[PDB]
Design a protein around this ligand. Sequence first.
Ligand code: SF4
Ligand code: SF4
Ligand code: FES
Ligand code: FES
Ligand SMILES: [Fe+3]
Ligand SMILES: [Fe+3]
Lengths: 635, 635
Amino acid sequence: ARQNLKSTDRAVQQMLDKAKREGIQTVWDRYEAMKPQCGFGETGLCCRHCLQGPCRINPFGDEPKVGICGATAEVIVARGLDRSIAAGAAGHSGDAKHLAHTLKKAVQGKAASYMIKDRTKLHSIAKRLGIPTEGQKDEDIALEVAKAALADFHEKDTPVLWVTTVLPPSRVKVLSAHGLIPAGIDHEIAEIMHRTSMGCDADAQNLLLGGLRCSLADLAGCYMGTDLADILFGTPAPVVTESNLGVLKADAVNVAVHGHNPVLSDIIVSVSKEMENEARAAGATGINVVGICCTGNEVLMRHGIPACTHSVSQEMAMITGALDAMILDYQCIQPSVATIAECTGTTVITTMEMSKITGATHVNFAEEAAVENAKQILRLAIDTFKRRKGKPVEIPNIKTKVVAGFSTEAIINALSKLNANDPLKPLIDNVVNGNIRGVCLFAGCNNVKVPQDQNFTTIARKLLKQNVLVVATGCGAGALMRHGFMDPANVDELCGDGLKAVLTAIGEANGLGGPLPPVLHMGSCVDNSRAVALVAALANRLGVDLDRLPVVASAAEAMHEKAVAIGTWAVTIGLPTHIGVLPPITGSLPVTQILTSSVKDITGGYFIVELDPETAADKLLAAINERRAGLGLPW
Amino acid sequence: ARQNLKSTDRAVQQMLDKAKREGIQTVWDRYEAMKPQCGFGETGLCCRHCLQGPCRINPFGDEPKVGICGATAEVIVARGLDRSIAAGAAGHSGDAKHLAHTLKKAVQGKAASYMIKDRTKLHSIAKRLGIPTEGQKDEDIALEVAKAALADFHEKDTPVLWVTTVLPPSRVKVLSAHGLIPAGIDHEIAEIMHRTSMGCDADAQNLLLGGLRCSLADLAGCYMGTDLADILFGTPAPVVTESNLGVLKADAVNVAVHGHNPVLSDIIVSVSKEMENEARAAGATGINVVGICCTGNEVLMRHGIPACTHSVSQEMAMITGALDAMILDYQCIQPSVATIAECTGTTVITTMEMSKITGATHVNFAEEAAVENAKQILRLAIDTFKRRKGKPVEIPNIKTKVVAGFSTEAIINALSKLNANDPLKPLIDNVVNGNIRGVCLFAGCNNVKVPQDQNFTTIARKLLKQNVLVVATGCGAGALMRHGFMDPANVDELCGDGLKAVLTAIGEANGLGGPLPPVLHMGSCVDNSRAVALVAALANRLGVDLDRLPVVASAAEAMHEKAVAIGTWAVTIGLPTHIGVLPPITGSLPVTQILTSSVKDITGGYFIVELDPETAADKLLAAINERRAGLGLPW
Ligand code: SF4
Ligand code: SF4
Ligand code: FES
Ligand code: FES
Ligand SMILES: [Fe+3]
Ligand SMILES: [Fe+3]
């Protein structure tokens, strides 16, 4: 079998060979077994919103042409897309809500394992929300910030402040004029579910305006999530670590943290250090915490925990035979891991009441009992490592060097070595003179339909040669880190002369043997909000709105409903937004035209749907260069 | 064509003939054009929760057997059902939330067309919520009640009070022990959308427990909706009116109110009386307000507005040629009405920002401008009536007499004529001696898959002969009213001797020429909460929980996601609950077994899935009689 058609990651290819000869079914095998997939669903032309269904519409030809209730293709497509945005919003904001309750508990004395770690961040958030700090205790400031976070989930006298206080006033003004500012995060999710139910909203433009507003609720959830985690766990600064399956170690207890919420994994990290000697006694060198998906990104950014794999290839960590435990909370966890665990000997542990997997061991995690629960979990991992004594494992000897931890604050600090009191100016200077063509954010997942990482790396390589400053989050950062894009030793090979000069100048001014890495890792998926903060700060420094800046986003291999919500709010805040996988919209030309074209007249952003990555790179460059020409810059 | 295979309503049959020869496509024609429908969707074995999809699972045979991410049939079925419950919850609770904001505006001086109409109801609700009334102004009590309603949508220090204060403490105790009490209405909707997104909750029992809890959020939305509308518009008392298309009048301006929220339609009713002479000048006898769906039920219950049609047959009102306007807010409105309007000359008017229909005229309704907006809308209706001057119309000369308005308070009052200080005892007496075998609630929609009204009337006839006291809401009440079941002249023909004696005894004691009607109309779909109040009051009077009472529910022809939510909370509060249409669950035997059987061990309720109405009637009788035998009663 040609494993490079499944993944461009050589360590993943090696594990696919091992899974094949051991007879362990993979996500790629389940994909093959699903082909050919349903064309009504692929195009968006299916509706199950009531029990008169299921209804479908032929993309071309004869009947059925319309849903049983009269719903058109346009309504059906818009309604399905709207529910996906609401679902993504519900995940990101459920993540943030957990962080909000955790911060509240922490400063109320209910969970001593948690504390205010970043006082500076606490105060800057309180100030941005209009929460007075002068004369207040940190605990009381934090209490107020947690209360404001929870208040943004419902209607109140103010709109969602994690939208209106994080975007430039001019952007908020154009969104308010279209009625797009969310009134409450869960309020908007519920309204989507209402308006998309049978016999309700049946106008594509009305429905899609609702989706834009719900995407801003998703953005608020992301930004709140990043804010609260930085308070609780620290704002990331530049770190050095490694990535890919070669970060596992046969002689250690290998513990993957997988899912999204750092309330769990940050505790695993610190507790695993406390139990090192208990692990030495079981015959291990120690506990080797490694990261998968966003929760791994979280502990990579803050602690330098090596990333072992991401997204579509998550099963391959287990296939090595050396993964003793996989500790889960929620989101983007293939449920197959619970059945594969029986073949690989991995102990799979769920921790969240609303995210169980049949066959997995459930260990309830309560923030009030975080250390005790973590030790109960890590002891299951040690028992498992003992059980594989004298078993051979196959860990591919494949890893990359990863410089990461580029929070927006860290980026501002790095630039400040070139201009202390105007740190954004050196970046803008080099945009203006052409050393930086523009900025591209890579975000989102892998998708089994796309050879793993192929779009991310193909697009990134073209952009970097054209002097684009590339930043990345989530499993887009995962793809780029696993292929060397976060190793500064690759600046010469990857970057155009102008971008190299800039990365080198900044790196030299920060006391480094050389340049920043080719791609700046800005964090998890909620940390797409960091890219927003940076671009908003650039917008404010220049006196223009985001839809005039040479900034684009690419969800190059998108999968999750969360990635659709992110892409939609990237469009809503004004960015040309590439998506490298077909969302289910092509069954409706009017919807596609709204999302790819007429939405420009509303928010200035627009979707770029392009499945061929070389073509996508050209379209993203043209989008960047059209912005440059709109600022009167050469390009 | 055999029109009685489409509808058992003779007036609907006549209009189907007219639509056929005029070439106007109907919901039944769009259904025919959809056959055969997708079996993966019918069985629940389809998932589009991420962009790796669509995924499907063969009910039998070979691959695909599992979703691409590893999701089993059980997870896929549970996840889809959970989203339908959340969507229904979002509709009923969005309805209530609108009523809450309307009551707040009214007692804040912002909307003088609205007022506290039922002071007694206001105070009894405030008392039930623990809101002190002693020494308070009505406006301040109402302000507090509106604030408590809005607070139930989010997390707070108390759970959802429109659950915990409306069910017996013993029922709340068994639900709390299973973790089923909702924490906030929109909180639960969002959590469903989160836990059902890709890579999250993947255990059928865990997922379905979540659905039970979200259904209680739906129940809270229903009960809040009924409570607030009764405050604002009056608690219903016995009324006499008529139903079916024969209530339209060629010589009047015929105005249908259609949708769900009475904040709009109650104003249409009163304003339409003010503009009677303006309508006389356009050559009409007056304005003939008639009802469709739940908003018609609302004005039927409170004002005696005749019901013209319901649910699946809503288009047929327009086909008469005499419907000058159809005034819409949201929910259960077939979007086809906007295109049919062009053939029939009806003016279709949308009023709610989140519920537009392409091609319909949008007139924004603001509660602050209710009278002015209503007159702008009614003037469009008058213009339309003038345009059909000299046109023939075909109004089937078919209607029934309808006694309705049986709120739980009205039922208690009627019984109190037999026992002033213990009004529930005469009912319990006649349950015990066998004159009343038990109680059956008919609820929910019509569904195009079922010949309209056939399940409702077949089941009702068998139950009434067996002395079951039948109550009904929504389009179940609509089906029964259109077939004479709310006409007391039909008691002799329809009711067993024991039930007749009881209906006659109660009717005689309320100064009537004879008995109560064969079926008690308890209101709209949110007014299913009234049936809950009655059964809860019976439970409390007897000292037992609802799952020991001889009470059942039948969603005999269910359609909307709302009907699934209602059925699920009927099971959750302890009722044997028939559904007469296949929900998409049969692709998973474990899910079906949970919902039809093992949930008995959790809540005491259970689903009875039975598509044959004679068999369903037998199963509902057995369920009733098993309850009777559990109380030690003969049966
Ligand atoms: S909402 Fe309309 S289009 Fe969707 S399943 Fe029901 S009848 Fe069909
Ligand atoms: S969530 Fe799993 S089952 Fe559903 S579409 Fe995505 S891969 Fe397929
Ligand atoms: S018909 Fe295949 S997705 Fe519904
Ligand atoms: S395959 Fe038909 S409902 Fe999805
Ligand atoms: Fe993620
Ligand atoms: Fe209804």
